Each structure stands twice: as C-alpha cells, then as structure tokens.
C-alpha cells in the first residue's frame, strides 16, 4: 500500500533546528509525498522537551551533552522513544532523518569533542529506530528511500 514515512521536521523547512534555522530540502518527490499526507514531520529534540533555540549538543557514547557540560540525554532519549511510538502507532517502517545530528544522524555525527570533527556513527533516534527494525535514510539517500517506499506500493 501507499505507506507513510517519518521525516525530521527541519528537512520539511520547519524552524526547529538548534539555531532556529531550517534544513528544508529541494525535492519534488518529498513535496509530492507531503502533498499526499504521507510524510509525518517529527523533531525528536522538540518532542523531548528542548527549546528552540538550544545549545549545540554532541553524543559522548550513551550520553548527550552541551559544550558547557549540561547533560541532555533525558530529553534526547524521550524524543527517540516518542519517534518510535509514532512509527509503531502509524505502521511506519521508513524514516528520512537529518544527517550529522546527535538525534537524527545516520551515517555521521560529531565526535563529542566540540571541535567540528565528524566521525562514523548515528544519532539517538536513528539508533533506536534501527534497533526496532525501521530503516533510516538521510537526505543524501533520497533515491534509495524513494525506491524502498515504491517497492511495497501495490501490495
């Protein structure tokens, strides 16, 4: 059937990023999906109770902290669980999440040293969704996500 996906709200142009900006991507496919009511916007950090703007944060293994040392893991873990809850309730098995984020990253994240250095890894929400069988794609993998969603359309 024409299934739904969960999408990082910033990729849809919502100004929920830590700096109050958006990461709206130019995509005819994603626009069409949204026009059909199939792209459910979700921001784990805002759902988890963090404000907008909010200080930058990085993973330090299981913890998520700001540069000043404030531990925000509780909010990151709440937002990841709420993303999973929305997927389970709506029967969603695919996610399109923002690359590099301590919540939404899927191929890379910042290394926890607050020095602008990236490493291979995933954000807290991506890790939880993948652990529960949900496939996560970044905005650099739109062709792959669009194909994965198109293969189950006639079922």
The Cα 87–Cα 126 span in angstroms is 12
Q: Is the peptide bond before 10 cis (omega within 30 degrees of 0)?
A: no
Can you read off the two tokens belonging to residue 77? 């873990």
Residue 17 makes contact with ligand [S] by CB under 6 A: yes
Three-state DSSP class for residue 68: coil
Contact characters 74-113, ligand [S], x per CB under 6 A: ---------------------------x------------
Residue 12 makes contact with ligand SF4 by CB under 6 A: no
> In the chain, what is the straight-line distance between the N-terminal and C-terminal CA atoms, in Å?
5
Residue 18 makes contact with ligand [S] by CB under 6 A: yes
Which CB sits closer to ligand SF4, 21 or 150? Answer: 21
Where does this chain bind ligand SF4 (CB under 6 A)?
8-10, 16-17, 43-45, 98, 101, 103-104
């Amino acid at each position: 059937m024409k299934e739904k996906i969960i999408v990082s709200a910033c990729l849809l142009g919502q100004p929920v990023r830590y700096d109050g900006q958006s990461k709206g991507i130019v995509s005819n496919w994603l626009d069409a999906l949204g026009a059909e009511g199939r792209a459910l916007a979700f921001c784990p950090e805002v759902a988890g109770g963090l404000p907008t703007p909010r200080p930058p944060a990085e993973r330090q293994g299981e913890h998520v902290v700001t540069e000043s040392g404030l531990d925000v893991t509780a909010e990151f873990d709440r937002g990841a669980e709420l993303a999973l809850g929305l997927c389970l309730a709506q029967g969603i098995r695919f996610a399109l999440l923002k690359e590099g984020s301590p919540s939404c990253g899927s191929g890379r994240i910042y290394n926890g040293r607050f020095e602008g250095v990236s490493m291979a890894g995933e954000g807290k929400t991506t890790a939880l969704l993948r652990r529960h069988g949900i496939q996560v794609f970044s905005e650099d993998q739109l062709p792959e996500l669009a194909l994965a969603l198109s293969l189950v359309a006639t079922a």
